[PDB]
Swiss-Prot record:
PANTHER family xref list: IRON-UTILIZATION PERIPLASMIC PROTEIN (PTHR30006:SF15), THIAMINE-BINDING PERIPLASMIC PROTEIN-RELATED (PTHR30006)
Protein name, per record: Iron-utilization periplasmic protein
Induction notes from the record: By iron deprivation.
Presence of the UniProt keyword Transport in the record: yes
Similarity comment text for this entry: Belongs to the bacterial solute-binding protein 1 family.
Amino acid sequence: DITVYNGQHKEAATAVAKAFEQETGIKVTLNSGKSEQLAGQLKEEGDKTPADVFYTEQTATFADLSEAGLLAPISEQTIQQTAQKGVPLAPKKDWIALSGRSRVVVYDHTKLSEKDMEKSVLDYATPKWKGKIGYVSTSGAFLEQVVALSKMKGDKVALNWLKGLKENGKLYAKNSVALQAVENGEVPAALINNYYWYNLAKEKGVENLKSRLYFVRHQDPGALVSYSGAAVLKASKNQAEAQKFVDFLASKKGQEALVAARAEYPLRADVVSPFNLEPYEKLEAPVVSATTAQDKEHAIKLIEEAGL
Ligand SMILES: [Fe+3]
C-alpha cells in the first residue's frame, strides 16, 4: 500500500488512484492539500516523511525537493514516454511530467466573440479591460505564466503586465472561482487553465454554458502549456510500489484514467482525451525551459514589485 501526497485537484488523484488499485491491487491513500503546503511539509519531514509519492499540479513544484535530494530517480524509459514538445525533463531524472494544462482566456460568448479577444495575453492587462478581466495571482500556473513572460519578453514586460493586472484586473482566489464569475456574468473574461472549462461543460452541457475558450496561439506567452507531474520520495519504504505507481501514471492505462476524469492533455502519443480538447498542435504553444528554483523566486519577486 502507498501514501500519495496530493497537490492535484482531488478529482484527478482519486481517478488515477482508483485505476491503479483496480490494476494492481495495491491500495492508495491520498493526503490532499495545497501544493506548496505539501511541498513545505515534505521538506520538513525529510527522511521521516510517510509520503511514498508526491502528485501535484505543476512540475515547477518539484524544484526545491529535487535540490534537497528528496526525490528518487525514475526509469529513463518511463520519462521518455511522456517527453513531448514543450515538456520539461528533470535533470536528475527524479520527477516526471504527466499531463498538460493550457493557459486560456475563458469568455462570456453571450457578450463577446473571438473578434473581441486579444492577439496577445499582454493586451488584457490594460485600461481597455478595466474591471473586465479576471486573474488568479495565487495560482500555480499563473506563476508559471509570469516565469514564461520573464523568459520570453524580459522583466520590464512581465512587470508592466503584472502592474496592468493589479490596476485593471479583477482578482479571484482560485481558477474555479474565476470560471464561475464568468458564467455568473460578474466578469466578461478571465485567465485560467483549460481543463476547468471542459470539465464544467461535461457536467452542465456546452449549450448551457455562457463561457467558451479563446486560444491566443502563435507562440504567444499566453499560449503557454504547463505540466502536472509526479515524484517518488527517496524516503519511501515502499519503493517497489511507489515506482510502480509513477510508472503506472505514465502508462497508456494510467494516462487513460486521468484523461477520463480530467480535461488535461495526455503526454502519451497513444492516448486520446474523451473531452475533445483543442488539438495540442493547433495551440501553437511556445516552448519554455523548466522553471528552476531560482526562476520561481524571481517571478514571486516581480509579483511583489508589481504590488501584488
Ligand atoms: Fe488547477
